[PDB]
Amino acid sequence: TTIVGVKFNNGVVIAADTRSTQGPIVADKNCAKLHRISPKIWCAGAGTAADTEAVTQLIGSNIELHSLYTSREPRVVSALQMLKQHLFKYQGHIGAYLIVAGVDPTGSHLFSIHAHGSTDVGYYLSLGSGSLAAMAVLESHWKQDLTKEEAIKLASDAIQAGIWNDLGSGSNVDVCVMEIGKDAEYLRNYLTPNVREEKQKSYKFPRGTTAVLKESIVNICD
């Protein structure tokens, strides 16, 4: 996995790759690693896939209920705190490595959370097996006072670095842009630089190729 987060002028952007491994096997070639916690708070997750989804949905549920109770839009620090306290409680056994970002009435925020419950603040962050490839790019090209378009470029470039150079990362680039005063825009498959080439042959079988012993109609109705 390769996930990043980049702060810019009037907001924050996060990105991720779309490969899901199972050892050396690619289970999913186009999986969604960007999670919605609240409408304007999104989370990119690396590590144990079932854990990143389960923890982001649980906190997202509790955030929605909190938002209704308080009659206020949720804050990123609320998500951040609820997540780290949950992760810390399980002492790293919930293998969720997250990058949390969003906009709230306080402003635009970007954080990272490790499985053990440690949080970090930054203008640019990267997590996952391709975090070193991505951070190399970020440390080379990042600057203060980025624009929305500059930040999306930097982010997707950082993810690409992981796709190409890291075997645990691959396929496509997902992005989500959270700008202040605007609706958050989720860019699913923002880049698709790994399209499978045409096959040399069609392996469509002549009908009757397969040997059959029995046939029967299944009753799905009542």
């Binding site: 810390f88 440690s118 949080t119 930054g122």
Partner: protein
């Protein structure tokens, strides 16, 4: 210390001086030989004029510091502003009772108007030690001298230890208020 978990090294210090107390630290955070964060803030506020320096496990020290901040906020609501000694006691109580599951080395520093600048260190075991300073110091140094003392001391730690590096952050606690200081590599390296 759990395997692969984020470590905070150990280059932190707090020094008492004439007008109050100064906390100092580096900004490096590691996961093995990889620097996870090079601009970390290891100087954390638990109360208006009570701060701490964190070492060891980043997760553990954050969870504790958060709890302490909770206890001192609740203390203040009921019983008024707490002492630096009280803050150190709460830290210790947590670090001592949960010593089997924690890896946290904490230095507590604060400013009272009666007690002035105080420094308490809380090592791995969960013991408390009140000191004049913690990590040719003299008592009642000036602000400028104490800054140079912390600067020169951490500068050397960074020079020889790979777990240490980045910027040198400092927080000054006085009756005047709270002042944040920062010193970049180009300045401190060539000392």
């Amino acid at each position: 210390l759990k395997k692969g978990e984020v470590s905070l090294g150990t280059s932190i210090m707090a020094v008492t001086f004439k007008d109050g107390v100064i906390l100092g630290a580096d900004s490096r955070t590691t996961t093995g030989a990889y620097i996870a964060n090079r601009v970390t803030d290891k100087l954390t506020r638990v109360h208006d004029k009570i701060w701490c320096c964190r070492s060891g496990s980043a997760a553990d020290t954050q969870a504790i510091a958060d709890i302490v901040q909770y206890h001192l906020e609740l203390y203040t609501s009921q019983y008024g502003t707490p002492s630096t000694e009280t803050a150190a006691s709460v830290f210790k109580e947590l670090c001592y009772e949960n010593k089997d599951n924690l890896t946290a080395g904490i230095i507590v520093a604060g400013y009272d108007d009666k007690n002035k600048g105080e420094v308490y260190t809380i090592p791995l075991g969960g013991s408390v030690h009140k000191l004049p300073y913690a990590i040719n110091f003299r008592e009642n140094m000036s602000k400028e001298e104490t800054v140079d003392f912390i600067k020169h001391s951490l500068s050397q730690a960074i020079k020889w230890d790979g777990s240490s590096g980045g910027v040198i952050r400092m927080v000054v606690l006085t009756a005047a208020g709270v002042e944040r200081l920062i010193f970049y590599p180009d300045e401190y390296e060539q000392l």
